[model samples]
Target chain A: KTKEHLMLAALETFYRKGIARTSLNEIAQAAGVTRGALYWHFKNKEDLFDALFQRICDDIENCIAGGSWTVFRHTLLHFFERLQSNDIHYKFHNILFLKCEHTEQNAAVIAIARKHQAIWREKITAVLTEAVENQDLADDLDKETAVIFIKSTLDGLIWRWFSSGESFDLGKTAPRIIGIMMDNLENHPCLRRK
Target chain B: KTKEHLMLAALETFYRKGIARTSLNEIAQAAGVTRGALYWHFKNKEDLFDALFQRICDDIENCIGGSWTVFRHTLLHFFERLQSNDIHYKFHNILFLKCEHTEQNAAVIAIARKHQAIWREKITAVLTEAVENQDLADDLDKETAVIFIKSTLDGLIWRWFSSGESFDLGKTAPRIIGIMMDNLENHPCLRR
Candidate 1:
């Protein structure tokens, strides 16, 4: 119970103060616990941060797993819907992308972030490959290029929505943009292997 | 002369230590100037950053101005050339993706947002002209399509730089961007 409380406090504090400026004592105090209890839960600030990040990744994975990955369109729509509906998920991403810096001290966090990205790319590629084999997508679709295109489009849109200080109805815009990307996957001649 | 020296020093310092950690004293010392001299040229760290960003934008605009004809091909070619060029590309990566966007760096953030808006408007205008010329489909969703293309290109460049310079920018960017343009032409969904 205390550990869960510590993690929640860490998320709130990290979101507000950022990972670099936040201290373990503040997290403990925010959790209404002692420093000793905080240490018992996490060895250091990085450890605590990693725990929070891991929990977020787990939640995202669970969300993804709930949807059928075989259908590329369905999976992407589901993923974007989750991003729209879940406030915590949005806050987690905002904290990761906007609030944190990829400094030397944050090497572990960067590694984890890269690992998650690689895994997502891998999953998307698998789905595209499946779609090709199932005759749902074009035979000549270049899966690797398609993956980069889709990933970068999503990454860019999300970053803009959160960090750019401009308001676009993400719930409305995400689906429309994503639909465009999906159409590109099967229709764009440039996506075909030359 | 002193102002130029300070700007160079500031860029190196910001690139190395980041804007948040870099102090004015360090920038002054690096440039062989006093703290007062630094303050004389710029009000604060944010001011120094804005100057650097503005210079970069001007340089990029000058480069883009040199290119001519066929809005679609011109943009793809310009973007490719920008990625291939070393100095401007590095500055772009550092400014856009490397730096953290936070309340502390509000000035830089605001500059970035403005630059993005301006770039998007320019791209949309070019696309609109292309549509009128019948170079592109008449039904093209100029605004939506422009946003996607710009965002994806920036995102890809950042991802490549951050992930490690494993991929060749010049080699890959053209094809990726071309694919997006092709999609804009053929994909009915991208059309209004």
Candidate 2:
């Protein structure tokens, strides 16, 4: 109960105060628990943030597991579909993408933030590698560039949505734009191993 | 002379303090000028930010004014042929990908959004001409290509900088972006 309460408290507090300024005691006080109880749950705000973000990462990982191009496409299609509808998930991303400061003081938390980005980067790489092996993409295609190419499109689209909801229609646009990236992955010359 | 000096100091100070916590007095202090002079140059932090953000792009967006071939070369030139430590790159580095957006900083955050739109528009405008000149597909819709291409560049730069820029952006980008530009003529998602 205490761990759950503190995590919920950190989510709201972290978005507003922007993490570095958000204290362990403040989250504890807001959670209506003692600061010592907060410590009992996690070592520090950074440690607590890792736990908070991991839930989102694991959930995203669960949705996007893939070996074949069909699975990769299907998994990503499902992921973006949920993105348009998920309110809590949107706020969590807003914190990482917009609210958090990229400063030395906040460096550790920011590092963890990007580490999850890389872990997911690692995740996408795995799928792309398999896509090549399965003959979904050109066998001689440089999967490394393909990995960068896919991640860029999704981040670009999602970053726009997070910046302003009305900037474009995510629901209609992501599925199509994602197909565009897949098309590029399948045929674009920049991705060729030569 | 004074405005240029203020701009330079302002750039350095924003990245270090991470902008929201930074004060106008501090920027002036770093520049060794009167706070009123900083005020004279720009109304507030957000106002100052718009000018700073654009000044960085104005010069680079200058890269887009020529014919279609030049447009492609210049776009790639903007992506490639740059080292990590230049002031030109650092200005954009902090402004877009690194500095961040917070509640108090919403004004500047909005500044970035409009600035992005304007830059996105700049691309479409150029692509419009290229489309008319028959440099691209006859059925090409410039706006779609604009979003796809610009998003690719921004997203690529965002992830690259996030990774501490360990790879040579100059070396790796030409091929990565070469194909992105090639998409305008080839990829179905990019065209009508």
Candidate 3:
């Protein structure tokens, strides 16, 4: 319970002040715990930072594991929904993608982001391959590039939201965007196999 | 002359240390000028930082003002020059990857945001003329097409940076733009 409290405190502080500037002692005070208690739970900032990433990543791997068009679509829609609804998830992502720098201090935690990203590549490929099998996608759909297209769209969406002050409604608009991407895959000539 | 030196100094300092960390004294000292001269040139770090961005901003519209093919060429050309040009590459790397969006750097981000918006507006205008001249898809969600194109560019730049520039973006980007253009022609999702 105390460990959870510390993580929430770190998340809040890091979101406001960047990870490079926020100190361990500052996080402990925010948590209403002493530095000793903070150290008892974790080694340092990067260790604690990795745990924050670890929390969100655990469930995302299975978000599209079912390998059906319906589930795959829902998984993406729900991701945007959770990004809007869950305060912690929203902040952690903003911090992870926007607020922080790719400096040496966050090297390990950045690796965590990269690791899950690689896993998503594999997981999404399998899902799309099945969608092709079930005829949910075009038979000529280039699945490798399809995976990149989906990932790039989401990456751009998230990047824009984080940097552009969330000018549009992400959860509602995302479905239509997903539709555009799906339609592109089914109909677009360039996304097809040669 | 002295002011230009301060901006050059500021550019190197910010590129090396980022905006939030680089102090006025350091920049002034790096320029081999007095702090008084630095203040005479720039109100603060944000002002000097804007100058760096403005130099690049002024060069942008002409880059995208041409027709559809020209627009596509400029986009690819922008990425291609990153390997060979220092100022363009440093400015982008610092803007997109190196800096953080925060209250402390609010002015810096605003300048970046301003340039970004101008770019999107310019691009949207280009797409419109593209349709008016009967050059591109007649019934396009022109704004939507521009947004995805811009977002995709943002995504690819972020990817290119994080991946250490290992892949050939110039070679890959043609097809990347191809699919988006294919959708621009007749995709119904954006029509809604």
Among all candidates shown, the one with the greatest lDDT:
3
Please give the distance, in angstroms, between residue A172's alpha carbon in candidate 2 and its true position after superposition: 1.6
Q: What is the TM-score of each predicted model, taking all chains together? A: 0.88, 0.91, 0.89
**Pairs of residues clashing in candidate 3:** none
The lDDT values for all models are 0.72, 0.74, 0.77
| TM-score between candidate 1 and the true structure | 0.88
Candidate 1 at residue A49, lDDT?
Answer: 70
By DockQ thresholds, what CAPRI class is model 3?
Answer: medium
Model 1 residue A38 lDDT score: 86
Standalone chain B TM-score for every prediction: 0.84, 0.88, 0.87
Tens-place lDDT per residue, model 3, B1-192, is 546778879888877777778899999899988889899879898888789888777655555544877877777777777767788777777777668877889888888888778888888888888888776667676666666677777777777676556457666677777766666655666553
| Tens-digit per-residue lDDT, A1-194, candidate 3 | 77899999999999999887889999999999889999999888887787888788765655654447878778888888889988988998898777777656556666767776787789889888888899988888888777777777778778877788887677656787777777777777777887
True contacts kept of 1: 0.47
Best by DockQ: 3
Sorted by DockQ (best first), the order is 3, 2, 1
What is the alpha-carbon lDDT of model 1 when measured against the actual structure? 0.72
By summed lDDT, the worst window of 10 consecutive residues in model 1 chain A runs over A63-72
List RMSD in Å for every model shown.
3.0, 2.5, 2.8
Better of 1 and 3 by lDDT: 3
Clashes of 1: 0
